[PDB]
């Protein structure tokens, strides 16, 4: 199985948030970028982070992604009054019992 552990996923999300502009859909350029903006004794992890980072970049192009902020790229009532409300029989009956009386711009449908 090739499930990415939470350590890989969390680092990938942090890389995407901080360096979104420097990333594209190519693994190899993304891997080169990540090796400069990441300190990690394991090259296997950095390769996995680059793989999941370019996966997130693909997903971001296809709409939003949960866990990624990117906070660089992150009256109709008057119209209805003019056209009338057309309240129900019982609703109209309630209005007739009010102190203000039946409001204008309403009908019995």
Write out the residues near other proteins by the rule CB under 8 A: 75-77, 80-81, 85, 87-91, 93-101, 103-106
Q: Is 15 exposed, middle or buried (0-12, 13-18, 19+ CB in 10 A)?
A: buried
Q: Which is nearer to other proteins, 35 or 81 (CB)?
A: 81
Instruction: Considering the complex, state which of residue 70 and residue 80 has its C-beta at the smaller distance from other proteins.
Output: 80
User: What is the helix (H) or strand (E) element at residue 41, kind and residue range?
Assistant: none
- CB 93 to other proteins: min, Å: 8
Least CB distance to other proteins at residue 3 (A): 25
> Among residues 41 and 78, whose Cβ is nearest to other proteins?
78
Q: Helices marked H in 1-109 — which ranges?
A: 6-18, 27-36, 43-61, 76-83, 89-96
Asked whether 8 and 41 are in contact (CB, 8 A), the reply is no
Least gap, CB of 77 to other proteins (angstroms)? 5
């Amino acid at each position: 199985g090739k499930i990415r552990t939470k350590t890989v996923k969390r680092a990938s999300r942090q890389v995407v948030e901080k360096y979104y502009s420097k990333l594209n859909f190519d693994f190899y350029q993304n891997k080169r970028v990540i090796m400069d903006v990441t300190i990690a004794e394991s090259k296997k992890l950095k390769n996995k982070i680059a793989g999941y980072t370019t996966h997130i970049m693909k997903r971001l192009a296809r709409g939003p992604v949960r866990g990624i902020s990117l906070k660089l790229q992150e009256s109709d009532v008057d119209k209805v009054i003019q056209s009338g409300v057309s309240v129900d029989k019982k609703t109209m009956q309630m209005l007739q019992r009010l102190e203000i009386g039946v409001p204008r711009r309403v009908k019995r449908a």
